[PDB]
Design a protein around this ligand. Sequence first.
Ligand code: 2NC
Lengths: 99, 99
Amino acid sequence: PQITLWKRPLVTIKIGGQLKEALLDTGADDTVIEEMSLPGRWKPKMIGGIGGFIKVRQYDQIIIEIAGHKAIGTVLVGPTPANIIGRNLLTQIGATLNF
Amino acid sequence: PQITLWKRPLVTIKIGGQLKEALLDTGADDTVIEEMSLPGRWKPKMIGGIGGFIKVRQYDQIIIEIAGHKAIGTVLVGPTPANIIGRNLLTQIGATLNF
Ligand SMILES: CCCC[C@@H](CN[C@@H](CCCC)C(=O)N[C@@H](CCC(N)=O)C(=O)N[C@@H](CCCNC(N)=[NH2+])C(N)=O)NC(=O)[C@@H](NC(=O)[C@@H](NC(C)=O)[C@@H](C)O)[C@@H](C)CC
């Protein structure tokens, strides 16, 4: 698709058997999801932006479907105010910014 | 251009006759720049990010070039960790996300 930017670019995702809404964020290095269970080992991470940092759990090799497009990569889980799809998964679905 | 997302989507901007680097950010409603001087009166605004909320100064109808493309619009100035070009100006330069 071509997604214009008049509104926030929200899409449906499927992760860990669950449907969620998430923001396509070219300004995010990483993908960050609100609290949920994921399989495998994890390690803690601190991630920052406007307002400072939050602590998250890093899970690797997680399969996600983003607007119908499957992507595997790292997902961070924690008290984010918004589910965010960051560049680590945007690249995998072939997303580009065009102007 | 077509900007891929394997690296941060950093571009050069021009504001107040000065070149700066900024991040093209589809996950940002607004454009937020690190402390600098702009002309005119400002109005207060609170914005939110990953970590919480911060206060910024809102300047309207600021002339700004983004990767060579001319825009005139609202610029927020405050303690952002990074200069970000948000959707208010991405729409002025005709940017879309495509996959
Ligand atoms: C300034 C730092 C770079 C840009 C920023 C854009 N992220 C979006 C996230 C979505 C909201 C949580 C954002 O902050 N958007 C703001 C930008 C400010 C603005 N006004 O435009 C926004 O739209 N804020 C809205 C409110 C959105 C709330 N949304 C919601 N509740 N669903 C606002 N009007 O105040 N990126 C980030 O916050 C990411 N940070 C990073 O990628 C890097 N960190 C740093 C410090 O650069 C990396 C080294 O970790 C986070 C997610 C970690 C991976």
